[PDB]
Amino acid sequence: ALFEPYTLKDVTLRNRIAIPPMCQYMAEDGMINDWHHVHLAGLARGGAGLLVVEATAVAPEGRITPGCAGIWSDAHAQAFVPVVQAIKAAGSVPGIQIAHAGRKASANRPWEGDDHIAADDTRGWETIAPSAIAFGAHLPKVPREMTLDDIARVKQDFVDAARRARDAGFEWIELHFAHGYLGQSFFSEHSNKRTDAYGGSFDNRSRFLLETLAAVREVWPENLPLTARFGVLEYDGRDEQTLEESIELARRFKAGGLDLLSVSVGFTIPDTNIPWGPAFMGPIAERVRREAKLPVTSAWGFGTPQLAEAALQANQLDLVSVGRAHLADPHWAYFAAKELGVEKASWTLPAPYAHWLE
Amino acid sequence: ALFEPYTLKDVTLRNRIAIPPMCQYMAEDGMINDWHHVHLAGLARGGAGLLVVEATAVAPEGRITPGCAGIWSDAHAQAFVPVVQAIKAAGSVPGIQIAHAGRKASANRPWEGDDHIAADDTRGWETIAPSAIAFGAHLPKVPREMTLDDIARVKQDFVDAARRARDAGFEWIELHFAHGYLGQSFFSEHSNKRTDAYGGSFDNRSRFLLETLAAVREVWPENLPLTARFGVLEYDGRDEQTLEESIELARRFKAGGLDLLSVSVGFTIPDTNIPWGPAFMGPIAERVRREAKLPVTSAWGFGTPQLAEAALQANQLDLVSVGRAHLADPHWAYFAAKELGVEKASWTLPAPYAHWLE
Ligand SMILES: Cc1cc2nc3c(=O)[nH]c(=O)nc-3n(C[C@H](O)[C@H](O)[C@H](O)COP(=O)(O)O)c2cc1C
Ligand SMILES: Cc1cc2nc3c(=O)[nH]c(=O)nc-3n(C[C@H](O)[C@H](O)[C@H](O)COP(=O)(O)O)c2cc1C
């Protein structure tokens, strides 16, 4: 099952292995470079059917850190062209996750503190969010409450980002509405205390996300997969209520043209108790897939080939996202093919490699 | 031992893992491209201390196949510059093997026949060698016997190639005098039947190789490792006599400025019986190292970490060459570090990967 092709709209993936977006923190002023080119081209040659580029900021203040990639200008977008072309040359589908970090923005790289940048550090910047409330813990900075014009501008930033991704050659797009960043924070009652049209009720909290999706849909080709990542629960003691609302939003996403949903955890606040475990997201993703009748993918621990295979065979997911295993071994798809006893497993790789490994 | 640094001349390798030259057959008219750039940069980031670029032809007719890389012009050399710089940026030492296929030239890619190109194929060309005798088997073409001027020209081609490698930024060079190609064929009595100064006696058969080394030494920096690969035996029923002569030549190489010898098998003729096995070259390399008092490396089956470690600890080799395992997994060095229980094994890789794998 892991090596069966998958067709969504006009795009066909050679297998069900998806490399989820994984920040590299190697960009400068949002511009990607040879780190990203080699990293991504190398992964594409590894055999995966889909390669989704890391969270790319739609605006400067939407970066998580000073090392995050951006696509807030045509120059930023053009930098992606040679990479997109190399990914296609390798036979993998090029995708990209566009995002805005919201209150979790202006933070240090993970190996450089992983915390909000100091007030007197020249690299930092003011964060924006639905309400002026801090995440807490290692991200204590209180963000600035967005005005209606800030909301209009951020939506347009997402539109510009999607238009740029389209013209750069990407064939798959993912809106980052998860992990406590801007989109996720608008949906969660923990972070959204607004009393206007963008806060309060389920309809109001969903508004920013739905309007952004609709706005993006106007510029994103209808024959190319339009997707999003969304945290459907927080493990904050309100899981049943939260999951029910999240599933309802997933239904609205589908009706609004979403082709597939990447199911994740919210990470909206720090006071939670997440039951980490191999493929622990499987059951949750399956319920969303079933109740919203929408294709899904999920991640965490699927680097074990048999787990990926099992999840697909049980129809818990349509695509299996494998992250860290690809950082350890960019040719994981080849390792997986061997593990599952696929015929001519070495040919998951290009001839220059395959010929000698068969 | 595998992760102990190694200093040769002014160059210091971060560990004892060497990626031996491995043809990719992806060049066009000798010009390398993004296949090579991503392939090599990716391998450098994998952690290996030394990365030796594939056999690069010193002349067009010296290519093994139409897909072989070349460095017979300054334009060809300049194409290597960005790759060399990416390898250095990753902290690996950039090396390159310069070569001339001799009678084994003008052959099809391994996955496209692996045999001598048909007479009426527009991609083929006449081969040259010490004597007009064919390898046989899948390489039946009888090569043209070289004139003294052909020999003078090929030597100059090696000099030009080394000068170009130097100016491109390479910090390690390897002369390809093995695997039945031109250099190896001049030394072997099987292929060399000349009756002039370049054939007959041990001194005459060694002449082409020694003169080429001396010529290259004039342009190659004295503070950068000058090495060569040489087949010390053929497994043709004349191993003791052949090994004795090969060791004597190794002594002449050392006296002539060779800093390290990559020990291999001759592959000069097809009628042999090679005892393939994991690290089977270990004992032979050790004897050459001991009797010629020259640093050495060897390959075949060292992809098993414990074998590489064992070979180093027993002083059979100074560097361990790991080939195919790197095609399967460009991050083999990381796999090896874990296998051998190295402290902070994930940091064999760059921060963007290491931080998440520790
Ligand atoms: C270095 C690194 C960068 C990541 N970057 C992103 C990102 O930009 N956007 C996102 O939605 N998830 C991101 N994630 C979470 C991964 O996409 C994935 O869901 C997670 O690693 C769990 O899968 P795994 O167990 O296969 O690694 C990242 C994870 C790591 C380790
Ligand atoms: C694709 C491929 C290309 C190779 N190219 C070269 C070359 O250009 N020059 C050379 O001396 N040896 C070459 N070799 C032989 C390797 O350097 C190495 O000695 C051999 O693969 C044995 O080591 P391994 O068991 O670790 O793969 C090649 C081997 C493979 C599989």
Would you spell out the secondary-structure blueprint of this structure?
Two copies of one chain form a homodimer.
Chain A lengths: L5 E3 L2 E3 L3 E3 L14 H12 L4 E8 L11 E2 L3 H5 L2 H9 L3 E7 L28 E2 L14 E2 L2 H21 L3 E6 L4 H6 L14 H16 L8 E8 L5 H17 L4 E6 L16 H11 L3 E3 L6 H9 L5 E3 L2 H5 L3 H8 L11 H7 L1
Parallel strand pairs in A: 3-4, 3-13, 4-5, 4-6, 6-9, 7-8, 9-10, 10-11, 11-12, 12-13
Antiparallel strand pairs in A: 1-2
Bound molecules: flavin mononucleotide (2 copies).
The site of one flavin mononucleotide has 21 residues of chain A, from strand 4 and helix 10.
Report on this model:
Chains A, B: InterPro entries: Aldolase_TIM, OxRdtase_FMN_N, YqjM-like. Chains A, B: It is an enzyme of class 1 (oxidoreductase). Chains A, B: Its EC number is 1.6.99.1. Chains A, B: Its cofactor is FMN. The structure is a homodimer of 358-residue chains. Chain A has twelve helices and 13 strands. Helix content of chain A is 35%, strand content 16%. Chain A is globular and about 60 Å long. In chain A, helix 1 (34-45) packs parallel to helix 3, helix 4 (148-168) runs parallel beside helix 6 (202-217) and helix 6 (202-217) runs parallel beside helix 7. Chain A is α/β, with parallel strands linked by helices. Chain A has a single domain, classed as Aldolase class I (TIM Barrel). The interface between A and B is medium-sized, with 31 and 31 residues. One flavin mononucleotide binds at residues 20-23, 54-55, 97, 176, 178-179, 229, 299-303, 321-325 of chain B. One flavin mononucleotide (FMN) binds next to strand 4 and helix 10 of chain A.
